[PDB]
């Protein structure tokens, strides 16, 4: 019932003008500025403005209309302002607002994603991939946004520069490798969905597998291999089972190992075997082979697959402590 | 360096549209609404808007220009919206904003005080005078505004209707009779300043004395008289000293007691004497009479006057415990 229609442009105008007031105060007096009562008020109005615009958009019922008339002026007021400002001055509500228009408009704004990523993707990433849990709110909204593009504007991932997509996977990997069991599971959730969306893009699926399949596999295993971290074992099994099943069912037509083009099954078996032999040279060769065989054997029974993994971590922990 | 000129119009426009959004949500679904995230965001934007405007006005440098060009639209957007709303939806920053413009513009907006008081005085007063410490922020801002007007737009107190001017005094009395030292001293400080302001209004001065002098005197004593309440004794002494000095110097030309027109000195002596006798029938007439004479004797030595009062409390206290 929130109606912002008649003051919508007025709100964006106030937003842009307050942004400049904030920048100017920073370009002249540093970040300490951000603590002054009035600069805080200006930040608040920018923040609450996005929340209101977000709630207004999340309950509209004419996606094309919103996409053509409201989104353009919104991106004009928030994108470049977020990109060119010091981290201490970027409103995290800008990321959450993008996520909200994506979940609401999907395909109607897919063409807009590149423009949005160029403005908030890499700079936001550099703010959160720093171990130190600084900018926890941006980290949250970052993944809400990524989860949204992945869900309703998937094509955009192929649209952006391959080098940028590489960073997309890097943040996902970084996320499911995080100690905060909450972040890690959003990463695994994103990774699972992404792999499924990739399978729908038969045109580009092979390039993806060829480029990222083994990498992703290696990283997932590095996490399950890590002592004391049964956290998310369910999703690891879920993802691994899915990936192994793709190979067994011959969904990956390209030869993952272009070097020595053999069966992906044969290559994958050796590949995973080596990963494990390396991480644990103490492991008996024939037992590693049996463990890997079971990964394909149980690739369609997640609960069984999970237990299979669990048992193997005991055939390692016990051999240590 | 807050440059609102560019967006002032827009800000007031958003303020007005959000108010309507809030009113509609309330006047349709009860007060409970005010707790919803979006209604809160609206309220916050309205609040920060006033803070930004207040801060901008406080650093302006052309009082006349501001009063003729910025105050009118501001009052159009905030006054009636404040008055006709439910207490739970009246922004206390409206009161503080009014105080700031009064303290900055003074006589340039004296003509607007009547309009401001009609919109925020009584409704606010009724919100705070309820013993229960509710709306503690409105209360604080209420007196900040009252002080502003008293200090810079005194004449207005003569312009508003006498019945309203009587509510002004009632609230000042109510405040210095409060349990909170903080509130009480604000009341005493306002009272002292208003008494002085009245002295400069020769024409209206006599009318004031004739109507309020004895009442004020009685209320002050009722507080000084109260057991366990040494709080603000210095101010009580300062005010009483001032009042008795006015009478001794014949500044009150009109006859306080129109009934039995005698010397204000003679009448005032009996007046305070009886006040004390009624409240404390256990006091000796001659002892009371001496205490009163001492009030004129020391009316120009506040420290001595204060000690005079302190000693009299003991010539009452110990007679109990």
UniProtKB/Swiss-Prot annotation, chains A, B:
Recorded GO CC terms: annulate lamellae; Cajal body; cytoplasm; cytosol; intracellular membrane-bounded organelle; kinetochore; membrane; nuclear envelope
Keyword Acetylation: yes
Chain positions of HEAT repeats: 69-107, 179-210, 211-248, 296-321
Keyword set includes Phosphoprotein: yes
Source domain of life: Eukaryota
UniProt keyword terms in alphabetical order: Acetylation, Cytoplasm, Host-virus interaction, mRNA transport, Nucleus, Phosphoprotein, Protein transport, Repeat, RNA-binding, Transport
Protein name per UniProt: Exportin-1
Record lineage: Eukaryota, Metazoa, Chordata, Craniata, Vertebrata
């Amino acid at each position: 019932v929130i109606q912002l229609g008649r003051i919508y442009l007025d709100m964006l105008n106030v937003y842009k003008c307050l942004s400049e007031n904030i920048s100017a105060a920073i370009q002249a007096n540093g970040e300490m500025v951000t603590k002054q009562p009035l600069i805080r008020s200006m930040r608040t109005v920018k923040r609450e403005t996005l929340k209101l615009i977000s709630g207004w958009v999340s309950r509209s019922n004419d996606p094309q209309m919103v996409a053509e008339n409201f989104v353009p002026p919104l991106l004009d007021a928030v994108l470049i302002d977020y990109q060119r400002n010091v981290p201490a001055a970027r409103e995290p509500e800008v990321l959450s607002t993008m996520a909200i228009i994506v979940n609401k408009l999907g395909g109607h704004i897919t063409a807009e994603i590149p423009q949005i990523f160029d403005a908030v993707f890499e700079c936001t990433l550099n703010m959160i991939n720093k171990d130190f849990e600084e900018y926890p709110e941006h980290r949250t909204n970052f993944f809400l946004l990524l989860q949204a593009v992945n869900s309703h504007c998937f094509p955009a991932f192929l649209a952006i520069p391959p080098t940028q997509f590489k960073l997309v996977l890097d943040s996902i990997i970084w996320a499911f490798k995080h100690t905060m069991r909450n972040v890690a599971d959003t990463g695994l959730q994103i990774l699972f969905t992404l792999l499924q969306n990739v399978a729908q893009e038969e045109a580009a699926a092979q390039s993806f597998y060829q480029t990222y399949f083994c990498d992703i596999l290696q990283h997932i295993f590095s996490v399950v291999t890590d002592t004391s971290h049964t956290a998310g074992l369910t999703m690891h099994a879920s993802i691994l089972a899915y990936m192994f099943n793709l190979v067994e069912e011959g969904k990956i037509s390209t030869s993952l190992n272009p070097g020595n083009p053999v069966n992906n099954q044969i290559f994958l078996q050796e590949y995973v075997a080596n990963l494990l032999k390396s991480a644990f040279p103490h492991l008996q060769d024939a037992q590693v082979k049996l463990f890997v065989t079971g990964l394909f054997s149980l690739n369609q029974d997640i609960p069984a697959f999970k237990e299979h993994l669990r048992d193997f971590l005991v055939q390692i922990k016990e051999f240590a402590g």
